[PDB]
Amino acid sequence: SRAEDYEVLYTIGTYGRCQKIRRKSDGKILVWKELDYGSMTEAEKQMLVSEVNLLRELKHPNIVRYYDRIIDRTNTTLYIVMEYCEGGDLASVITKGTKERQYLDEEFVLRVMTQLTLALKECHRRSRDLKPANVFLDGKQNVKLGDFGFVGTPYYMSPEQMNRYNEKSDIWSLGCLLYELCALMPPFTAFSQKELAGKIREGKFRRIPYRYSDELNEIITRMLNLKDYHRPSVEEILENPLILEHHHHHH
Numbered sequence: 001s002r003a004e005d006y007e008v009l010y011t012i013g014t015y016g017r018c019q020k021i022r023r024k025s026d027g028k029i030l031v032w033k034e035l036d037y038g039s040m041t042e043a044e045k046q047m048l049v050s051e052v053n054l055l056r057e058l059k060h061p062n063i064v065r066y067y068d069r070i071i072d073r074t075n076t077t078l079y080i081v082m083e084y085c086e087g088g089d090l091a092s093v094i095t096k097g098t099k100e101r102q103y104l105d106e107e108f109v110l111r112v113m114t115q116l117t118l119a120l121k122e123c124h125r126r127s128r129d130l131k132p133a134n135v136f137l138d139g140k141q142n143v144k145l146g147d148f149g150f151v152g153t154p155y156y157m158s159p160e161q162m163n164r165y166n167e168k169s170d171i172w173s174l175g176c177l178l179y180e181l182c183a184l185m186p187p188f189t190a191f192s193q194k195e196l197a198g199k200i201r202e203g204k205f206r207r208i209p210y211r212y213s214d215e216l217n218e219i220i221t222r223m224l225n226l227k228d229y230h231r232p233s234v235e236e237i238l239e240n241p242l243i244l245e246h247h248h249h250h251h
């Protein structure tokens with residue numbers, strides 16, 4: 001639990017700085033998030049301490065794992081140490097498919113659907129945005145939900161979270177994410193949020209590309225029902241014949 005115990009390999013991204021690191025003792029590959037709390041109030045640091053302790057409370061194969069926290073009071077820097085996911089985030093995968101003009105395999109979409117649905121179920125059980133930038137791939141085809149720790153348009157904003165949220169709002173968002181994985185675009189696009197809001201209330205979107213089975217289109221479509229009570233539950237999603245053992249996590 002000391003900075004010197006790890007060695008930085010290189011910076012991945014720059015609230016702070018994310019770095020790929022190696023634990024000296026066993027040579028394990030990890031990452032840490034680098035935060036400068038130097039300018040924080042005692043209050044802001046109090047909320048940060050309790051947010052970080054909530055990261056520690058969740059151990060699930062489909063949720064990005066927390067390992068450690070290092071305080072360096074000399075540089076007023078705080079490091080959050082977590083799982084390295086070698087395949088990166090889903091935003092990149094989607095962007096890479098848009099440009100290489102190549103759609104993702106149904107088998108891949110089935111993996112994301114199964115494993116995100118299980119990550120969700122685990123979150124609800126303890127009572128995290130479901131956007132592509134916060135979903136990660138490890139080296140073995142496993143999917144992991146991370147956590148995020150005005151300009152943007154809220155493509156995944158559910159009908160109910162628009163007209164003032166429950167567990168079925170999470171299902172809508174999962175619907176929007178699987179949809180974008182399939183079509184390489186969100187179900188509802190627009191230039192403003194008022195336009196967006198317009199399209200969402202009509203509840204109309206294009207069928208996902210025809211290379212995807214009717215079965216996969218059906219389930220994604222159900223998640224995007226305007227009525228939360230017509231959207232399938234976590235349990236009803238996993239009961240779907242499409243979802244097979246090999247779509248689940250594997251060590």
Ligand SMILES: C[C@@H](Oc1cc(-n2cnc3ccccc32)sc1C(N)=O)c1ccccc1C(F)(F)F
Nearest residue numbers: 012013018031083084085086088089133146147148
């Ligand atoms: C800001 C950042 O937050 C992250 C980065 C995580 N991470 C773990 N292994 C990775 C391999 C490649 C890229 C990122 C990886 S997890 C995590 C979190 N707590 O949500 C982030 C978020 C999305 C995409 C990229 C980045 C990064 F570049 F800043 F790392």
Ligand SMILES: [Cl-]
Nearest residue numbers: 061142249250
């Ligand atoms: Cl796993």
Ligand SMILES: [Cl-]
Nearest residue numbers: 097101102103
């Ligand atoms: Cl394409």
Ligand SMILES: [Cl-]
Nearest residue numbers: 202203204226
């Ligand atoms: Cl309709």
Ligand SMILES: [Cl-]
Nearest residue numbers: 206207208209
């Ligand atoms: Cl189409």
Ligand SMILES: [Cl-]
Nearest residue numbers: 167233234235
């Ligand atoms: Cl549910």
